[PDB]
Design a binder for this molecule. Structure first.
Ligand SMILES: Cc1ccc2oc(C#Cc3cccc(C(=O)NCCOCCOCCNC(=O)c4cccc(C#Cc5oc6ccc(C)cc6c5CC(=O)O)c4)c3)c(CC(=O)O)c2c1
Lengths: 144, 145
């Protein structure tokens, strides 16, 4: 339920690395091609617009980065180890496939792929998209 | 004022800060972008419209109308561009950056630090809702239809 849990993981394509944050409760994601500085900055930018409370990671890299440790402290985020995404860096890989032609730089193509994911109906028809649903989840938690 | 944004450039430490403002909420998003308005300005908006609903984008100078790349980005993402930007958040954003500038090496971070603060403060102490609170309520509301 919690409106501010996320997962974080990397994924590689065309030699460059793609950091991916997924809001678990909704499936809304954000991504970017990238250091621990980069991730720290990435997280700072993310915490600065969504409720980013706890970040789950599946390896130890992030718990060694000084800046990251400084970012979470500054923004008030709990790193957690432990844990949807492998089912979801493959869709992103799929969508990036259909757009890579449209983009000079890989980095535009990811954001295109991001665009698609958050805008399309999660159900393929009717209901909400992920971008709508994250907003809905958050709206319902403040009025608490 | 559902998906209406306003766009502007601000300057400090010999760098260019692009600033997107959601009109009805005061919600802001910014980034360090080149003097040249073009590819990276188009990239900024693509990411922006991936995060939020973005239908219209106002400006009151011609820079955003000079770039082939920006025109395609708005075309690709379904945005509308309109001249005339009918705000001064740049006044207080620079104040906060000045406040938090010591706590980071890169101006970049300080900016995102200031962005963070501007969008999260109010309902604070009393207040009612911050920009970030306001944008979410506006959007969640509109989706009702
Ligand atoms: C407490 C705490 C917490 C967290 C923290 O974190 C950090 C950090 C950091 C850091 C790390 C390393 C470098 C730098 C840096 O100094 N950084 C300079 C500048 O950085 C800003 C700019 O960054 C580069 C972005 N550049 C682009 O995006 C780009 C470039 C070129 C082209 C394009 C494009 C496009 C595009 O768009 C389109 C849209 C639509 C369509 C149809 C087409 C297109 C196209 C074209 C295409 O089709 O391809 C984009 C900063 C700190 C800092 C500290 O520890 O004290 C910190 C501290």
């Amino acid at each position: 339920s919690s409106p501010g849990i996320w997962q974080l993981d990397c994924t590689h394509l065309e030699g460059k690395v793609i950091l991916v944050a997924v809001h678990v409760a909704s499936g809304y994601i954000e991504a970017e091609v990238i250091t621990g500085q980069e991730t720290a900055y990435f997280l700072l930018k993310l915490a600065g617009r969504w409720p980013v409370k706890t970040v789950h990671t599946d390896n130890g890299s992030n718990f060694t980065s000084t800046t990251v440790k400084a970012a979470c402290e500054w923004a008030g985020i709990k790193q957690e180890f432990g844990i949807v995404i492998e089912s979801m860096n493959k869709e992103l890989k799929k969508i990036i496939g259909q757009v890579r032609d449209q983009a000079e730089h890989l980095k535009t193509a990811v954001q295109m792929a991001v665009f698609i994911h958050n805008k399309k109906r999660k159900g393929g028809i009717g209901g909400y998209s992920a971008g709508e649903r994250i907003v809905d989840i958050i709206a319902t938690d403040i009025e608490t």
